[PDB]
Symmetry: C2
Subunit: 624 residues, 2 copies
């Protein structure tokens, strides 16, 4: 053979591959190179025209190399939105009707997500990212693994990212928490399901680092989002800072912004120092041709600012920005955007050991070679990598210092949970009886959970030291009620309402898999064990003085091996969230700490509960 395709001819002959997100990017190249390797490929994506173009290019290339009947080797599945369970079912039916059993599931489709800080991230947007990027991967595995096991072989490859972290270390990805969590979950799925899916099925993840074009000059869109986010953060922080030492309401302070005139605000002797200094910064550091140097904000930034203030408990009319003067384009000049873009690019290039951006083709080639390896499962392959970014090793204690524990005297504690009644009882009693907290607000899910805690804590309920709130599916409003009625918290300890499910994770070879964890149950797992913590953190990260502990699920000697796997899946995946929001919290004027406490280790009862109390105290006791 002659030509670079030689390395490929026969490499994957006889295999059927399904590739989601197959019309462009790494997915299109994986589908191209698998087809050149002899596999029959189904390319799934939303846009019909781009899929048709990709299909025609691959078929033409196959013909050049000597394949016949190339129409039988490359099929497409257009209009496939992987965030829709119904459309994933249709994709599997279409693929099995075209080719029969699937050998390779290439879970490649991915959306960028909300691309906002957690405190600006709508809850439904976070959910959408999880459905598109993570739950879709489980869904397709659940539909195709039964046939793979029955035929005796199969392969599931999840296309994760360097920014999903590593097996025992988390990486923050600011303004991308939904994306990072989804990437971490794709990796965690391979790590924890491999022992169940073997020996018939291999499951691995790839985690490329930065790849050419993955931020779509190539960084101008990212640069503009960065500059818009900077303006939002600086305005919010100056308003919060001003409000600390000014008697006016937040409503009246925001009215100072309504002229939308940087020069006017700087010279307004009635404006608080922090807002006059901010305006001086916008002018001093701005581009005279950018309207951001003469105008404070625009409609989009104002909407996000208003939402932060509302979510932090400030009262303002919804129409407060309705008459805001619109700054003339450009809000940021091309000079400013290109400057920030060069900053982004130079930052990434400086982090790469090899000082060179891999291409989509390069990454796909390495991946298609890797797919030939029949002796690996449960691994995360890095087809590009070598980065100087700092990681946070996970899952490595004692009690905090006596001086920090004394700062809990008179504190207000929020505990969130329902299932873990023994933990909630003991933690409430430790804060109240050992460390002199003024009160504990117990936020549960249901009336039955409330009555259970009131019975366990009867003495403190009667004494007015334990209050109970029933949150249902409205945890944000429940936190609002607690703030209004009982005051802002110091310690906030967030445990999951729900236990882990007790269902099998794989089926017997000749079983219909009807009892195996369903696609809807996996979505519920994400809702109860990830989104629960995200919704609490999103609110508490606007609550000055809070120290938030996110607690992952318990495993006991009664727990099944499936529950141990799901606990480990959740621990890994939530660590991506915890690491990311920790960095984002450095940008608000509100001072908050966010830490994760894992109940499942790596495997009398009162000592295991006591170590939990100590771990929680270590991250919720403040410092003088």
């Amino acid at each position: 053979s002659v030509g670079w395709a030689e390395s490929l001819i026969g490499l994957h002959l006889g295999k059927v591959a399904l590739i989601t997100g197959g019309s462009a990017g790494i997915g299109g190249q994986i589908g191209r190179l698998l087809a050149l390797s002899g596999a029959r490929v189904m390319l799934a994506a939303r846009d019909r025209h781009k899929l048709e173009q990709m299909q025609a290019m691959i078929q033409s290339e196959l013909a050049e190399v000597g394949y016949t009947d190339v129409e039988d080797r490359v099929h497409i599945a257009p209009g496939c939105d992987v965030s829709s369970e119904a459309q994933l079912a249709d994709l599997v039916e279409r693929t099995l009707s075209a080719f029969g059993t699937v050998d390779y599931l290439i879970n490649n489709a991915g959306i960028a997500g909300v691309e906002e800080m957690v405190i600006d991230m709508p809850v439904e947007g976070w959910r959408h990212t999880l459905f598109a990027n993570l739950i879709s991967n489980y869904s397709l595995m659940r539909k195709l693994a039964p046939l793979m096991k029955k035929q005796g072989s199969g392969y599931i490859l999840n296309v994760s990212s360097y920014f999903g972290g590593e097996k025992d270390a988390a990486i923050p990805y600011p303004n991308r928490a939904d994306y990072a969590v989804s990437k971490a979950g794709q990796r965690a799925m391979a790590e924890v399901f491999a022992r169940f899916l073997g020996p018939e099925i291999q499951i691995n993840a790839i985690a490329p680092g930065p790849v050419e074009g993955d931020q779509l000059g190539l960084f101008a869109r990212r640069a503009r989002l960065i500059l818009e986010n900077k303006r939002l953060n600086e305005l919010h922080a100056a308003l919060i800072a001003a409000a600390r030492t000014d008697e006016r309401s937040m409503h009246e302070l925001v009215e100072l912004l309504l002229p939308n005139d940087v020069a006017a605000l700087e010279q307004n002797p009635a404006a608080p120092t922090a807002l006059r200094e901010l305006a001086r910064r916008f002018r001093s550091e701005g581009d005279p041709a950018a309207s951001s140097s003469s105008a404070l904000l625009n409609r989009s930034i104002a909407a996000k600012l208003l939402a932060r203030l509302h979510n932090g408990g400030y009262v303002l009319p919804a129409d407060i920005f309705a008459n805001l003067p619109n700054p003339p384009d450009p809000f940021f000049t091309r000079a400013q955007i290109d400057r920030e873009a060069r900053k982004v690019r130079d930052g990434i290039m400086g982090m790469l050991y090899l000082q060179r951006m891999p291409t989509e083709f390069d990454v796909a080639m390495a991946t298609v070679y890797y797919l030939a390896d029949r002796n690996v499962s449960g691994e995360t392959f890095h087809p590009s990598g070598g980065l100087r970014y700092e990681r946070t090793p996970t899952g490595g204690f004692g009690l905090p210092s006596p001086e920090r524990l004394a700062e809990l005297v008179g504190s207000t504690v929020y505990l969130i949970g329902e299932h873990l009644t023994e933990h909630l009882n003991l933690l409430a009693r430790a804060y109240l009886e050992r460390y002199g907290a003024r009160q504990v607000v117990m936020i549960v899910e249901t009336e039955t959970g409330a009555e259970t805690m009131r019975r366990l804590l009867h003495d403190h309920v009667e004494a007015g030291r334990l209050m109970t709130i029933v949150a249902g599916d409205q945890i944000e409003a429940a936190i609002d009620q607690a703030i209004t009625r009982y005051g802002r918290p110091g310690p906030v300890v967030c445990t999951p309402f729900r236990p882990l499910p007790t269902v099998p994770l794989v089926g017997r070879k000749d079983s219909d898999w009807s009892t195996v964890l369903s696609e809807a149950e996996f979505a519920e797992l994400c809702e109860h064990q990830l989104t629960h913590h995200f919704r609490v953190a999103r609110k508490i990260a606007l609550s000055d003085g809070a120290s938030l502990a996110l607690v992952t699920p318990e495993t006991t000697a009664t727990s099944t091996t499936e529950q141990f796997a799901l606990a480990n899946f959740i621990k890994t995946t939530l660590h991506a969230f915890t690491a990311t929001i920790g960095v984002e919290s450095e940008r608000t004027a509100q001072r908050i700490l966010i830490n994760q406490v894992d109940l499942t280790r790596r495997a009398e009862r009162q000592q295991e509960l006591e170590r939990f109390i100590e771990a929680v105290l270590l991250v919720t006791a403040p410092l003088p």
Copy 2:
């Protein structure tokens, strides 16, 4: 092209590869497949005949595929012992004379090592393993990286192992600590040197799991070593147990074994219970056709037993076993050996997710594809993997419980160190002044270090609470002196005598690299930062009641980025040792705890020192 070599033709055309351990195993297959891929290969090994056979097989295969002048494509370097620095220099000269600059350094050679528990592992045997398996890798990199950087490209691949651990988690490998440490160091070298060697040079490791034949039915040799080790451990533990409640000297107890008669010992009413029960176990659980069921030991086991007793401070004549009756072959029958071998095999197969052993050819093929990837550095690729073995996440606190701290009253503390005078001063003062230890024995390297500590601790020296011993290069004898003169220790805190070197780790492109960390300096680094701790642990693991803390090097704001890299290299590599000896310590009757305390994190001064004190106390305070 037709035939499985198609995937390879041209893949590595124009590359020159040096492969150590190239005459058999994975190394021979890597050399074969690189040659088929178009590379010119130099195969280095000890035995000339096996190398000549491998060379002839590869050249014949090249001719089949259509290469001409195959004698120019595959050279050999026989008689190459990679544990000899002089022979590595000769290998590089031979390779550059044959082919010019090397593109790929495949650091594949590896020896199994001592294959004994640490307490039975001669210090020179441990050193030999480090020279063959780890220091050799740095040495060849130091000789070939200058030419690689000058030409603008190169690749260094270290052939590590799953049993060298993972980036942020350690794996114990009992009876193989020297091997595991060497494998961890090969991985750590790639992790920490990649940022220095980029952008010109890629450096990665591979870490295969179990591979067919790697224990050389295939497990019978391992099985026999296991059974011999079991007999040694059970005899030693019964003697130590007997000595706790028997007034006779260890000399007199060992005399009870000299008839070498299991039945006689079981029925000897003058023998301690533990020894009569042991003999009953040997008979009851033995094979009547094995002489191990009727004889207590053989000359080899007796020699290792005598060395353990001598190393634990017991006085016995060197010739005590000189007249020991030799048990007739077989000592263990084929039935027993095959039984244990099936146990070993079934254990490994049960740990593999895919329930299938990869072959040498499979692993080599995956590796040769991986070598084509130009976008990865600093990674550990797993060409086989998916194992259920339990790992220990590293590098994740407070103070230990008041009840454990009270157990330090009246204790005897050993501190070992020299460079870290502030740590040693503060730790000694914490044990003596805060926790009421009876005495601290300060074991230093030199008279100057001794005088420095005596000056810092003058008050405690004058009061008779601080004793100093100068160990030089005789740390084992220094510990013996401390035990004899001051009593057995509780806490033992082992810090390195020496600081990390302050030299560059790479040279400028056109430099002669004359100031870069030399091959001898890297060997010294291993001696001072790894072997130091091994020698102390080897002795202290025979000292009942000790709690040993192994402390890795400090980095301060004054430390260079090179020192930060070397600290991280040492932390990773020593964690393999700490994890392994921790498991081995479960087999002795002596009760010892071994933990590792890392001074370098991931980056006023008195608070960093206070956190060190708390960390050390957390692992040296006993439990009621």
